[PDB]
Amino acid sequence: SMLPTLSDTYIPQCSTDGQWRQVQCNGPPEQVFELYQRWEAQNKGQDLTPAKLLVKIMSYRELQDVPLAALEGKRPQPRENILLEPYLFWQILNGQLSQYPGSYSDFSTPLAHFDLRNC
Questions:
Q1: How is it modified after translation?
Q2: I need a labelling partner for 52 at 20 to 30 A (CA). Which of 3, 4, 12, 93 fits?
Q3: d(CA 7, CA 26)
Q4: Is 16 left (phi over 0), alpha (psi -120 to 50) or beta?
Q5: Rounded to an integer, what distance in angstroms lies between the CA atom of residue 59 and that of residue 64?
């Protein structure tokens, strides 16, 4: 866990299609904050460093995934096999595994932000 969250995550943000946003901040993406909100909503007592451990764990087989955490599936069943497909204008939750390289999809970066950043 050599990454501190709020320290040096830039993620250059621009307000619309082609023009750079006039103010550039130095915080993590708001999708990561929403993922942290969902993780805390699953069970209390969750902090930053156990979240780093929990993403370090459950990343051993890549999908042969794991139960005991519901985030996008509203049909609780251990036998559910559906193809992964990205949807326009949504936070990426299900189809990714994040252990493998590639490219981001749909270019849905221009969203709002928090306050506690170096801008």
A1: Iodinated on tyrosine residues by TPO. Sulfated tyrosines are desulfated during iodination.
A2: 12
A3: 8
A4: beta
A5: 10
Read off the amino acid at residue 46. Q
Distance CA 49, CA 35 (A): 14
Site of tokens 């490219």: 103
Length of the chain as a residue count: 119
Residues 11, 113: contact at Cβ < 8 Å? no
Q: What span, in angstroms and rounded, lies between the C-alpha atoms of 13 and 21?
A: 6
Experimental method: cryo-EM
Q: Token pair of 84, please?
A: 């992964």
- DSSP 8-class letter at 100: S
Tell me which residue has tokens 């082609």.
18
- Stated resolution in angstroms: 3.2
Residue 79 has what DSSP assignment? -
Among residues 53, 79, 58, which one has the least CA distance to residue 69?
58
